[model samples]
Target: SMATRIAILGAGPSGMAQLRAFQSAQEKGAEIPELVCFEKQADWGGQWNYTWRTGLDENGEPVHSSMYRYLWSDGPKECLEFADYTFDEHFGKPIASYPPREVLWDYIKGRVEKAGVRKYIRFNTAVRHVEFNEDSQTFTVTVQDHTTDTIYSAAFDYVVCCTGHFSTPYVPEFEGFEKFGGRILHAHDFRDALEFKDKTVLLVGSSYSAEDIGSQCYKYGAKKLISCYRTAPMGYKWPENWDERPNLVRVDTENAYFADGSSEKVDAIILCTGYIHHFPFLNDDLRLVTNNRLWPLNLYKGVVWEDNPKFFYIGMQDQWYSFNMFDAQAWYARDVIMGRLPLPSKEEMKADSMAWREKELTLVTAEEMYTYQGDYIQNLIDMTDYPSFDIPATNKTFLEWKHHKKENIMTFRDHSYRSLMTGTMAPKHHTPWIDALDDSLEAYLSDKSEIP
Candidate 1:
């Protein structure tokens, strides 16, 4: 018969999902704990919350968003549409299968606005550290409130880390990088492709960011685009100006050398090298250590850290399923915190996590990967009342999107997909992705899709 205090770090997509989960539960007449949601930024929407500033904030906190201008939904909106809130419900009609950044941010904000959970958030506050006391079985969360220029500590019965892993840039240094004359930056700081216009740009990785950012440069008119990979090329049907090369060997004053004894005279370089699962705030024992992958061990269901069930990590995934996957996890974590779901012993939890990790190693094909992610989300959904939908159908949509990308990387966003939640097929965007220079919300929703 005691009140519970819960501390949720980061007010991004995952934190918002957790907040929404508890709000939903409370709406259903279940009593909830006191929630302290901290956000380092002035606003929410996570990466969707676009900011012109990069690298660091005024308070020296690492910048919260990795979003760049003119970035469209790389994946179909239908695939990640919230089951509880449909796109039709948000936009009041079928907008587009792939929307621009502003449009998607609006969509993310709509649900939380309706839920009225903004009051729970403490803006411009960053959690500095989280220390768990073994005897008390509680976490003392230390935070810095930039507004007040003060630091404070609050003890939480349960501490949930909703801080996304993408905020930290895993920047790697190359030989002769310091001596290079042209600009060099990681994708985390990339804001606009227009700056690279008429200048040859060299990308350093083969992941999605490399593919998308290189595409943005191509769309906005870069002179030439070179994507160099360590293991293998993305093998997409790139535009004539785009070319895939072997690993980036080094960069000279005016050129980038590749492993195949080839060099490109590039004006700038963007390292699309992926992010690390960074948790500098968490205690060393409680930190999550793994490269970006499908299944990270020690988390029983990828939500609850088995070492400490009270400490949960939301939306720390490689991300096949985005919003809805976070929803499933948030709901599950809520149930556990509320005592509606009982956790197993530490031994059993370890076994279950290892089982998932073992299965994660068996995955080879893209189809297998998405299927595995879908199944993982489905399992979380099965345990909670997170509004069940067709995971199989969603997996199929992902498969189709993959095929579409292979068919034509530049034109993949033009295709549409049926929603797994509302069962409504989405209409194509008003303007083709490459032609839609104005990625503003008004332009995206306008009759002619033009900026006024």
Candidate 2:
């Protein structure tokens, strides 16, 4: 008659999604497993949660937050809302499509608050290690409780790793970095764009971090913005102050040399590099080792860990789809754990996973890549009772979003989309993104004069 105990690491968006998954079932009169969620920060919201602190914290734990000031959602909010709880359901009316960070964070918190799952979360407790036993097929989770400054241990039948893929930065070294005089920091340490006002800023990667951070600097009065890409440029019609360059070769005290023999005088350098799939708390055998990609092998069905089936992961993807995708994954993982959905043999799981990887290797365009992810999410939804929304329509929204960015990156946020949940169109923001310097929740949540 004992309940099946499950240990969930991190209380971020994906972690909260897992909690909501089980809570939904319990509300429908189904027996649920015992759940425990470990959160390292003082509260939830993960990367969407911002912090002014840089580097290590008081406990010497690496600051898990990488959010910067004057930031808004990079994508439309309509694509990422929960199926069970629509934006209209939470806000009681239509809002803008691209709400700011705090606005989206509030929406995520509202679902779990209504589910009454806060009692299961242990805030400020960082998981130290997880070891799976062969005999009993259980996991021993060692954690450090920051509140009481004590280390404790627990055993669980299942472990869900909801710690996201963006925490640890993949900072590569450049020659002469040690001798450079101007400030050097990773994108993870970039707290405020106002700190670099009137200074020439150089960003080192071409991914979202590079594009967004470069935009942030330009918006907030930075003298100039130079972004270097290894593969290719973002190719957006960037502002006059922003220019795309080739890969960086090296740097001197006040200048950066590029692969094409071009050089630029810089005041400060921000390595807008990507992050790694780092889970130090997990042992070698239990850890999910892969880069940020559409298909990471060993995660059968993109949720269950292949080597150790009881262990699962959520939000481990290089996301084109964000919040709702996590909900789809969380629901699938819950059913598998509860024996409502059955997993295949290890060979069968790995074979299925590799098939997805094979398809992933053939993707050559952004449109194809997002379509691939949408198909994956649809596959998950077909297997579980997760609400079946129109992924193809969402994919079309993504295509339009990409075209908008291509047309004008600065003005893309000014465009709005129709919601898949409420069938209502999103109104344009009150101000243009380049001019709207205030990214606070109050400014973004203000009622528009008229809904579109």
Candidate 3:
């Protein structure tokens, strides 16, 4: 009865996706795998729900909601919706730029419930450890009931790890961090925009956190705000009619010494540093290199593990289009499960990861990781479409970077602009990365769905 006996960790979009793909594979006359999903949280949405919980900290102070208090969906309505699921007809305005986080969480929960996948979920269950049984050719997972402190065991022919990168905050530790007397916080714990009124804030690192905090803190009247990072911010060509806003400042440096080269006077240090993609439950032999906030340099696509074939990682790549990313990932995992795809051999996978692992190659430190945000899409397009494209050895770009104002010196992350998924002409705005993804997916599913 246990066809493939698959176990998926984490209840986020990716985990749900693997479950769905397995079911889809079964419908196509493949082995109907026994599905079991483990989630550490008691509710459906893992980080989504944890993000909104106010009681986690005992201070009774309102917790930081990562969803900015005034934040709305950065992408279009069509982009946020899960694949094979239609967003409820009534949401926001016609273009629906900013959907409230609660509504979005509700939408995800509703989608999960509607699919009848809730029955297989073990809520408040954490995967304490995972080990491969080479003798049996199966994986054994040690599950713990966080609520009752009870332990259990489960075995699966395959495992899909979908716990995303947002879980842990990669707060940077700088020289004299403890010596700095002013308030120091990571953007991960940032909750309210009003908290920074009239404070001189130093926002460190670059990426989504830097761009977001720089603009918001300035808007909220941060007396003086400085974004410190070593890399150049991305510049994008915005639509002629798009709403224009001021971009932010960046202090580019690998070792950031305070402006006066002294830390005593800075009022607040906001480490807008990004997060680390880690799942410690993974065995040591997997050779997962996650020392810094950046993921192990050795990934085929920043998801799947090369040395381990039994494990498939989801939601690792940065996309110009976040909406279609999940669907694209689902297709990859589906193909792998269906035996319609070929995985790189352990040696090959390790070698692929090794190419990016050189100590001096590029991006030597977290500071250098700050690249032009807009560059990733181009890089992804190059990586996918022209794998042979001879990218300059020192290529540093984010997935999608844009300039809010060409005349201005500042730049922004991809989500700052309108999400390309909405509007009648939305399809026309596809970047080269998206266009290639669309073409590939369409070709792959030509007989099953509309390829064009």
- Best of the candidates, lDDT: 1
Tell how far residue 56 is off in model 2, in angstroms: 1.4
lDDT tens digits by residue: candidate 1, 211-230: 99998999888999899998
TM-score of each: 0.98, 0.97, 0.67
In candidate 2, how many Å is residue 411 off?
0.9
> By lDDT, is 2 or 3 better?
2
Compared with the true structure, what per-residue lDDT tens digits does model 3 show for residues 1-452? Answer: 44578788877777776666666565557665578899776666644563534424332322323445434344344435443554533333232223445556666776666667777788777778888888999899998886677888988877777777664677645666656567667776776666888876766765666666666666455676655554554332322321122222212222235433533234677777676656678866653555443335555545566666767766664433442354455556656655666786777767765764553256553324433212332333332211222122212112222222233322221123233323232222222211122223223223333322
Q: lDDT by residue for model 2 over 57-167, one digit each (tens)?
A: 767788998888877778888778778888888988787777778888888889889989888999989899999989998999999999999999999999999999897
lDDT of each: 0.89, 0.88, 0.53
Error of 1 at 45 (Å): 1.0
Ranking by lDDT: 1, 2, 3
| TM-score for candidate 3 | 0.67
